[PDB]
Paper text:
Accordingly, we generated the E275K substitution and the resulting trimer, BG505 SOSIP.v4.1 GT1.1, referred to as GT1.1, was expressed successfully in mammalian cells. Thus, GT1.1 priming followed by boosting with BG505 SOSIP or ConM SOSIP selected for at least two different [name]-specificities, both of which have the ability to accommodate the N276 glycan and neutralize diverse [name]-1 strains.
Residue numbers in the entry:
A (entry chain L): 1 to 213
B (entry chain B): 1 to 100, 100A, 100B, 100C, 100D, 100E, 100F, 100G, ...
Write the structure that this text describes.
Amino acid sequence: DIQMTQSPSSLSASVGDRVTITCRTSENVNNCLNWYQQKPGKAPKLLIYRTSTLQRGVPSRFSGTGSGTDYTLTISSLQSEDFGTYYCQHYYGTPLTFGGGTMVDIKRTVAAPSVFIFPPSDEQLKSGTASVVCLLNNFYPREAKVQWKVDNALQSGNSQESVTEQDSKDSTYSLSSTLTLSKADYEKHKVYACEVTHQGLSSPVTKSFNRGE
Amino acid sequence: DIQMTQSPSSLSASVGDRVTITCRTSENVNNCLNWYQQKPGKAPKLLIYRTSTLQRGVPSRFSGTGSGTDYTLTISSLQSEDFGTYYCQHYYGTPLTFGGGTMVDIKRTVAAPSVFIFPPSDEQLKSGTASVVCLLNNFYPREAKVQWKVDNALQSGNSQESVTEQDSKDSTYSLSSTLTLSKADYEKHKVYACEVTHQGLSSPVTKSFNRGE
């Protein structure tokens, strides 16, 4: 029942920077500490075990040090493919415990999202369902909010979002929001709008279309 | 390990007839034999246990006898609600084994099925799915075969069937066969037919319709 605190909780640096992540345990874990890198949608990948031993196939720029209640993961030269959430984990007794995680990505200047809205196609409308797609293209940082409005009414519970991983070239993100309705519900409304808020925008951006126009 | 043979496999008698079902075992079962009644779509119901003892709530017209390898289930006066499949089961050691089962229903003259076909409704076609229904109404005996032909092509794996229990009045059965397609697959074909084979029909009967007519 050993508590584990990671610092920082979020981190952003440039390619080639030196990155240090600290893992503090409430009690001495006697070097029984492991480090993992998790990319979105994937299982955590083991980087370091037993404080300092690199796993097979892990690049040498990852190193681990520490003892007692103080442990450190170090990336000597940060690379583009090093984004994700890093976890420490102790195995000194039970229960096995993970740290809260530390999110890492490549730092760049703020880029506002470019917003596009797509009406459902006639082919899908024949199928009895209607999907309205809203695209937020090439923005940074990751934090973004998308709201759907059908005839100026805020929607809830009928949309899903998907985000791409941080691009290796421009270090931006892309996001798609899909509003799913039945054809009957889609046909009894006129205006379909997508409102986007992002710190790169001085004010929310709305893209809308009128059904059948 | 211990094999069990029931005789007969299928049985049809009139109301008030005396029905005798034989359960033969390959080895001595030592009177550790039970009898079950199973209605269609339901779990087996224990009728008699330990060769001869009736379960509470079982009418006295059911009786079980036998010893060694020969056992008998007797219905002194068959009633209409006695339809179903009857199983014997031994528990003299393991593995526990059941008999093959004996189907019982009320005897009557052969009745040919009245076949109807129903196209999918407009309300369902708007929803994006198409269900075509073929009805076999008031037939006897139970054995019947239904085949779906879409543009004269035999269909497989896209239909389900449901049967009513034997009617208390006329002792007939009714069956529905539902062919489920997507709206797209349904719209790319013209002729939809169900072909029915039954002993009451001198030749197979085909009911069909042309989509959009």
